[PDB]
Amino acid sequence: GSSVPAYSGWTLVWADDFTGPAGSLPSSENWIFDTGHSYPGGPDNWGTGEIQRYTDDPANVSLDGNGNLRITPLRSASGEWTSARIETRRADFKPAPGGVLRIEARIQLPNVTGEAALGYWPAFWALGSPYRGDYWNWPRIGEFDIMENVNGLNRVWGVLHCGVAPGGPCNEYDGLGNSRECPGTTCQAGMHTYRFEWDTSRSPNELRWYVDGQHYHTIRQDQLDATTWSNMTGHGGYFLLLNVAMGGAFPDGVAGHATPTSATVPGRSMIVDYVGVWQSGG
Ligand SMILES: [Mg+2]
Numbered sequence: 001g002s003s004v005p006a007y008s009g010w011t012l013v014w015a016d017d018f019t020g021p022a023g024s025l026p027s028s029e030n031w032i033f034d035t036g037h038s039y040p041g042g043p044d045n046w047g048t049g050e051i052q053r054y055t056d057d058p059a060n061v062s063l064d065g066n067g068n069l070r071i072t073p074l075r076s077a078s079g080e081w082t083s084a085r086i087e088t089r090r091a092d093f094k095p096a097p098g099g100v101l102r103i104e105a106r107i108q109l110p111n112v113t114g115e116a117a118l119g120y121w122p123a124f125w126a127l128g129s130p131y132r133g134d135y136w137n138w139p140r141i142g143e144f145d146i147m148e149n150v151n152g153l154n155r156v157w158g159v160l161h162c163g164v165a166p167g168g169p170c171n172e173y174d175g176l177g178n179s180r181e182c183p184g185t186t187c188q189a190g191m192h193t194y195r196f197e198w199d200t201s202r203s204p205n206e207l208r209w210y211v212d213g214q215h216y217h218t219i220r221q222d223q224l225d226a227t228t229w230s231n232m233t234g235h236g237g238y239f240l241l242l243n244v245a246m247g248g249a250f251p252d253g254v255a256g257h258a259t260p261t262s263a264t265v266p267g268r269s270m271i272v273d274y275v276g277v278w279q280s281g282g
Contacts, residue, residue: 001106001191003067004274008282010102014090015276022065023058026086033061034085034243042135050121050248051260052081060084068271071244073110073120075266085243091129093277094237095200100280103240104195109149109187110244110268117152119260121245122270124148124194126238139165139172142232146209147194148177150251151259154186155179156194158209158217162224162232169228173249178209178217191273201280205233240277244270 004015016030025033033056037045045051052073055061061071061084073083095101105124112120125148128141138161145159159177162170170176182192195210204221221229251259 001193002273004276007102007278010278010280011282013093013277013279014088015274016069017067017274018063018069018272019067020063020065023062025056025058025062026069030089031086032089034087039135045248046085046245047138048245048248048250049252050245052083052246054085054243055082056084057082061086064271068273069242070269070271071122071242072269073244073246073266075264081246081260081266083244083246085241085245087127087241088239091132091239092237093126093240094233095198096279096281098200100201101198102195102278102280103144103146103198103276104193104278105147105242105275106191106193106273107147108189108191108271110152110270111188112265112268113152113188115261115263116265117268118255118264119150119247119251120152120264120268121150121248121251122147123241123243123245124272124275125241126196127241128232128238129236132239139163139168139170139175140231141235142238143175144196144198144207144238145175145177146196147211148250149187150254152188153254154181154188156182156187156192156211158194158196160207160219163228169224176219180211180214180216183212183214191271205229240275242270242272242275 126144143161159175161175165172209217
């Protein structure tokens, strides 16, 4: 399972296998490191209410020397949470006409459960390119949550956001999502492969989510109106994001109260073996 797979009949567009020395930062040619509490001129607290400050500190984001990236939330003596959020420089990931785009990452979630896990919000996701530099055309431009998880739970959510917010056809801010337990080892205790496919070889087109090859969510083109679909697909494509947020809308909603709490335990890393993007056709 380890390392970027050599998929037959597909063409690798872009990947990062996170190879390199322990403690070094992932490639700045590949990645932008987002810092602070918002995009510049964007919604406060990353649009979610999460409370961590994102950094470029190796303590929050670094390679492990074994081929993985680690993103680690930490809590200072002053009580401040820090973490990291990286996004791809490339923002043109999109299926070729009539083809399929496959986006995938192999990840172990922060290995923490129960009250110690309250607030942990790891995610691997994609945002429509027109958002970059604008920050106020969400959800119209589209968002694919390929792996989303909160609170150390043995469950992955896969979600589409689209339309307008609040409300609209994608029921924002919930989005159109589904979830399932990780197959085999819990999502926290081992590596799993989280895959998303955007399929234009079929009509209606389809968006599909998988964990370890188990298909658990679909959104089809015939389930949304034409303007909503065009708004999230007609532009130049998507960029990808990896982060671990602390607190905010999703972990608070699932816990039923504010997170993190004094009992949340810092220092539990999300571990990422690779991220990759493929187009169908060899
Ligand atoms: Mg790797």
